[PDB]
Write a protein that binds this DNA or RNA. Structure first.
Ligand SMILES: Nc1ccn([C@H]2C[C@H](O)[C@@H](COP(=O)(O)OP(=O)(O)OP(=O)(O)O)O2)c(=O)n1
Ligand SMILES: [Ca+2]
Ligand SMILES: [Ca+2]
Length: 430
DNA sequence: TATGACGCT
DNA sequence: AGCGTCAT
């Protein structure tokens, strides 16, 4: 009863940039602003594959992982920006550099966990305690939360979406609990005020807009962030969880959007995250293993302990390129030349990482996919990485894969390779 | 039809 | 060490 721990100890936020690559291209070319546009890789085959879509283009049905030519059928006016192409492949430097712009601003407020190229988690527990000590005992104005949604509000006893927002926000604040410095709901509100500021700083200093979620753990923050995209942040309180989860498809919770989540649905015979509450921890552990059972048991109650790991920099640096279908590499000269092209971009990126971040990678991993193989990776081998030389790395990458060539005729290469991937890991300080 | 983090064995 | 899962 009192020994019920409710996972309200932390204040955690997930910040995520709205249509990130599109914003980056639109800062650079003002003509793309406020217009249906998408970002594509390559152009010859079907106009290129789309990887990012503005919200105006989304109104027409334009999605990621779609050919530009098909996109132009749903949206004739759609504008396109192309990813920079280097050494025969896509080069994403523009977007990685835009990312450190954002991560460095976010780092001044709290320590972040780089989660992707455009999203970071933030643990605001410490920042919130201090704000509570400066706001003495004085209340929190709705003017401090100009873009915040309180999930599940308004409730109880105006039909444009901004009027709703203030109604729920007023309800939340007018019932707030400012006399207690340990009230979890008051802490989420202070965290939300901090994130409004974080988000105004990112836009002030990059011109990029984002959404955020604020709650007690990474999972809820992440789910919360997506409730009011774009350019809005959503506070998900501990108390909103039973209603929020009662109709939430299990696949929507982070790590349940794949196979494990599908077997939760098929085995247990449920649909929504809330239905998990009727199962005991021992039942769940028998169904899915000690780790999954324990984590499933806590999570449907809104409790999750996976911490915000202080890590602003990737553990891994890698380049890949698919050669699907008839483009599959089928000679020794092809395989070596693309390994060289990949090795060359990787060396460009590693030298920059060494100067910037005072570290060197020590292991090189070569992954390949042969033609006729449902698995995304067919083979993965590693060797030492001792000089940032592209000709050595491509040589070593070949040496460790050459054994995979079926063909007895030595000049050709079978089975044809549909994918090459070089990857620098095992960093050491420098 | 380009990337990164982590678990399991 | 190497494969599998889950995500942006
Ligand atoms: N399968 C993917 C997913 C993402 N990205 C890149 C392009 C995106 O712009 C960026 C961030 O991905 P998101 O999943 O956050 O989606 P967006 O940021 O594009 O838009 P939004 O978050 O508003 O949906 O990462 C990619 O190249 N391939
Ligand atoms: Ca995003
Ligand atoms: Ca994202």
């Amino acid at each position: 009863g009192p020994h019920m721990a409710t996972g309200q100890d932390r204040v955690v936020a997930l910040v995520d940039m709205d249509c990130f690559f599109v914003q980056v291209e639109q800062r650079q070319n003002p003509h793309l602003r406020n217009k249906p546009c998408a970002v594509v890789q390559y152009k010859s085959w079907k106009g290129g594959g789309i990887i990012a879509v503005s919200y105006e283009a989304r109104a027409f049905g334009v999605t990621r992982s779609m050919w530009a030519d098909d996109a132009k059928k749903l949206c004739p006016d759609l504008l396109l920006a192309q990813v920079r192409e280097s050494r025969g492949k896509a080069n994403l430097t523009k977007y990685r550099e835009a990312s450190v712009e954002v991560m460095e601003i976010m780092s001044r407020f709290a320590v972040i966990e780089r989660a992707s190229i455009d999203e970071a988690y933030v643990d605001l527990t410490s920042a919130v305690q201090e704000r509570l000590q400066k706001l003495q005992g004085q209340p929190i104005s709705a003017d401090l939360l100009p873009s915040t949604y309180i999930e599940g509000l308004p409730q109880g006893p105006t039909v444009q979406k901004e009027g709703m927002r203030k109604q729920g926000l007023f309800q939340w604040l007018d019932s707030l609990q400012i006399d207690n410095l340990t009230s979890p709901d008051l802490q989420l509100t202070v965290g939300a005020v901090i994130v409004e500021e974080m988000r105004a700083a990112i836009e002030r200093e990059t011109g990029f807009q984002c959404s955020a979620g604020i709650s007690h753990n990474k999972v809820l923050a992440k789910l919360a962030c997506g409730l009011n995209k774009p350019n809005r942040q959503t506070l998900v309180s501990h108390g909103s969880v039973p209603q929020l989860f009662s109709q939430m498809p299990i696949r929507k919770i982070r790590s349940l959007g794949g196979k494990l989540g599908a077997s939760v649905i098929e085995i247990l015979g449920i649909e929504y995250m809330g239905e998990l509450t009727q199962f005991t921890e021992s039942q769940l552990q028998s169904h899915f293993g000690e780790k999954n059972g324990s984590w499933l048991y806590a999570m449907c109650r809104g409790i999750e302990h996976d911490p915000v790991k202080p890590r602003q920099l990737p553990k891994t640096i890698g380049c890949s390129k698919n050669f699907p279908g008839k483009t599959a590499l089928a000679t020794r000269e092809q395989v070596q030349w693309w390994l060289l092209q990949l090795a060359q971009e990787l060396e460009e990126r590693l030298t920059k990482d060494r100067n910037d971040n005072d570290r060197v990678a020590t292991q090189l991993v070569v992954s390949i996919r042969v033609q006729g193989d449902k698995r995304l990776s067919s083979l993965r081998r590693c060797c030492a990485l001792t000089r940032y030389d592209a000709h050595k790395m491509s040589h070593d990458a070949f040496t460790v894969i050459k054994n995979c060539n079926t063909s007895g005729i030595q000049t050709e290469w079978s089975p044809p390779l549909t994918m090459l991937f070089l990857c620098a890991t095992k960093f050491s300080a420098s």
